[PDB]
């Protein structure tokens, strides 16, 4: 509360570390469905169903332009990518499988990087 500060983690390297994690995501062989925004003019249903589209290139742009206030808002957008993917794709499809794989990949790197 007022004048009662918790000791808080050193967040000075967060931007660099999130960029490193995003780079590993971008270079994963299963990243291809997520590299660019879904084309809302070519994919029936997507605009109406997926209320907040997100993709790696959009995350990279927001990261590079100071649009994430903190590391949690970055993680929310990454997770949004895979939550959208689950909403629109069957688990037993290539993109569906890609999404689950990429989510798993992200969450381990997230834990390994920031959860001490």
Ligand X SMILES: CNC(=O)C(C)(C)C
Residues that bind ligand X (CB under 6 A): 33-34, 38, 43, 46, 85, 88-89, 95
Other CB atoms within 10 A of residue 59 CB: 22
Q: Cβ 112 to ligand X, closest distance in Å? A: 25
Q: Cβ 88 to ligand X, closest distance in Å? A: 4
Of all residues in this chain, which one has the CB nearest to ligand X in the complex?
Answer: 33
CA-based nearest residue to 60, from 101, 100, 31, 96: 31
Contact 14, 79 (CB under 8 A): no
| Closer CB to ligand X, 71 or 84, in the complex | 84
Distance CA 91, CA 97 (A): 6
Q: Cβ 87 to ligand X, closest distance in Å? A: 8
Q: Which residue has the tokens 């290139």?
A: 57
| Closer CB to ligand X, 34 or 68, in the complex | 34
């Amino acid at each position: 509360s007022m004048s009662v500060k918790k000791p808080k983690r050193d967040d000075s390297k967060d931007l660099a570390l999130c960029s490193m994690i995003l780079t590993e995501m971008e270079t994963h062989e299963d990243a291809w469905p997520f590299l660019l925004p879904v084309n809302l003019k070519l994919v029936p249903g997507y605009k109406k169903v997926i209320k907040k589209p997100m993709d790696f290139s959009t995350i990279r742009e927001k990261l590079s332009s100071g649009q994430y206030p903190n590391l949690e808002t970055f993680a929310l957008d990454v997770r949004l990518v895979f939550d959208n993917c689950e909403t629109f794709n069957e688990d037993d499809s290539d993109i569906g499988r890609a999404g689950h794989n990429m989510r798993k990949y992200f969450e381990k790197k997230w834990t390994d990087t920031f959860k001490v």
